[PDB]
Symmetry: C2
Subunit: 382 residues, 2 copies
């Protein structure tokens, strides 16, 4: 509450309705400084902007990271606002000819190639433009997903890439795991990546210049006090690099969620409180079309309650105490739920709900214009 | 395929990439003509624009329907571009003071009030503005949802409404059913609405002027030949009106899905075909952030395949036949799935997938700018 309370107090004092994203840019800077300085000299941090690509966020982040990871022409353009093309890396399973030509034209650092067909399409553009391109091969190690090259197929794609004079094969890209909260398990996964990369390098005798170790550094939305043990991970990661003799290989991570989640808040006023067939609901300004994370992940999103002491109406507020309460937005769908049957100690109409850990995949994944509501306002604290 | 094929052919001949919403406005007009002309004189159709509020769609629809049902200030503003305020009806569980003041200022036809607190906030605005407003009370008949007034609380809100001189209580709004494909069940639900409205009207001694019977007329995405039997519904609905003596009560429906679903298509080219740990995937241009319906509803969306014979590259296409295949978009999440493990007769890179029945809750529910991809192009067919 400490960070958002002065903002909420000022909005209330100015008779300004509360439906806002609030971002702590000071906390973001401190978090980034800590993460990036802890890394060994051969390892780089790229920000995966899919988590949050708001211009002010990218402006702030750009100083502290090696570059941006992007997955479309639009993200390339957003990244180029603050980084040279040579510090943008481009992944994704469906890169169009238009996107590939744009990437090559601008001079993107690496393309993370996901198939033989993509390699051939990229190569045709390079031959046409008379340019060269550094790539990684994205590997899907042995569940079935659409991403990367199936482990069994990687040898053939390596061989193809090596004989294409316009392609420079730097190494491999692994992004297998999502939202891992276990730092020791993460070290064991990186070890697997190292061994697979070295085995392919040794089999095909090409220099292992670079490995992209992906993201998947998790955030805990169920228990906010039990986050990824980054310092533990980094110490053991450093040891692993020495044990596996990877000091002369450049490494990068591509993190989104872990960089921006905890510095964002979605704050919204209570419009109505009602009981329907025994179940209590609180209806909030905005909705899950502005903050879809709880619906997408099917969880009760963490929040606190700002208890507002004044009353703008001549009739009493609606208040409840110590009820299972379902928090919903303004939308006309029963799917518009931030939290279902959660304990609320006290809540009244006019109070403000402060949703925490809203900085990553909050606004970015949301169906902003469903039902044509005005967008929330954005406040960036410096 | 007859409707979209000439559009796809033109795009291919012009070397334009295929990632489009295509709408058959002629089909839409014929559908609306049929629906609106079939209804009895005391019943009107309103279009619930949340299903699809594209301006060209609204313009076309406005020629046939009585009006628009809206649920936000943005939808009011869109509605007003194509209808006067006195043919716009405004519902939703969280109407802000700003929205209520806007609606009152413009003179919307009805506000469908969903709680005692909303009634009090609306009344405070009306007293401040020296204006009056016709309302319905939205009722949640005895599952818990956030919508409307719980049945056992309706008596108290009626009495509060009748005592407020700035409020004109016209009657009731019921919208409790969702995607119903059974026409006879739908008649039985309307029967229940009629009896409840009459009981409250008689108990509280005010004239029942109007009932909003809601939407929830379904569309079948699993079996496209088995749609809602509208003519059967209307015939029995007309009989029910006479049977229940509702001829002097005005009625409306507020349908979205049923009006626009079948006349929209989401069309996209195949960018890649790959096998990963035994499973085949076709990667399409665009994604479920442009057409989220298959993901939201967790189904395999109906589609057809248009084959393109030409090869624009100097290297070979990827071609497969008779494989169970998962169709995905360009996004970086394993959730970006249009259809899972569906048998495909034959498909190559460069071919086009035509997703049918994409007109309702297609673009309107989608997270358009996630990963910052260019929007699809929109084509509206008038011939």
């Amino acid at each position: 509450m400490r960070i958002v309370q002065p903002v909420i107090e000022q909005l209330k004092a100015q008779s300004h309705p509360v439906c806002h994203y609030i971002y702590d840019l000071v906390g973001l800077e401190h978090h980034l400084q800590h993460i990036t300085s802890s890394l060994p000299s051969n390892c780089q941090m790229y920000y995966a902007m899919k988590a949050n690509s708001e211009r002010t966020i990218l402006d702030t982040i750009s100083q502290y990271v090696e570059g941006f990871e992007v997955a479309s022409q639009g993200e390339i353009a957003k990244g180029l606002a603050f980084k040279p093309a040579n510090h943008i890396i481009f992944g994704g399973p469906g890169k169009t000819d238009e996107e590939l030509r744009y990437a090559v034209s601008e001079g993107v650092q690496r393309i993370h190639v996901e198939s033989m067909h993509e390699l051939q399409r990229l190569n045709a553009i390079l031959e046409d433009e008379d340019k060269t391109q550094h790539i990684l091969l994205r590997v899907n190690l042995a569940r079935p997903t659409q991403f990367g090259i199936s482990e069994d197929e990687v040898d053939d794609v390596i061989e193809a890439a090596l004989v294409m004079p316009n392609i420079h094969l730097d190494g491999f890209h692994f992004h297998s795991i999502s939202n891992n909260l276990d730092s020791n398990l993460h070290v064991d996964v990186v070890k697997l990546y190292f061994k697979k990369a070295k085995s392919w390098s040794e089999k095909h005798r090409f220099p292992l210049k670079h490995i992209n170790l992906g993201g998947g550094i998790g955030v805990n939305y169920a228990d906010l006090t039990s986050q990824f043990e980054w310092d533990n991970f980094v110490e053991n990661f450093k040891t692993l690099i020495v044990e596996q003799e990877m000091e002369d290989v450049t490494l990068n991570f591509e993190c989104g969620r872990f960089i921006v989640a905890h510095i964002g808040y979605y704050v919204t006023e209570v419009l109505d409180i009602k009981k329907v067939h025994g179940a209590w609901y609180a209806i909030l300004r905005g909705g899950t079309q502005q903050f879809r994370l709880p619906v997408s992940w099917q969880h009760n999103h963490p929040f606190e309650i700002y208890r507002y002491k004044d009353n703008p109406y001549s009739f009493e507020k609606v208040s409840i105490s110590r009820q299972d309460t379902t928090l919903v937005g303004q939308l006309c769908t029963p799917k518009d739920v931030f939290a279902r049957e959660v304990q609320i100690d006290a809540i009244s109409t006019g109070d403000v709900i402060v949703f925490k850990y809203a900085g990553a995949y909050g606004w970015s994944i949301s169906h902003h214009d469903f039902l044509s509501h005005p967008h929330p306002e954005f406040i960036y604290l410096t």
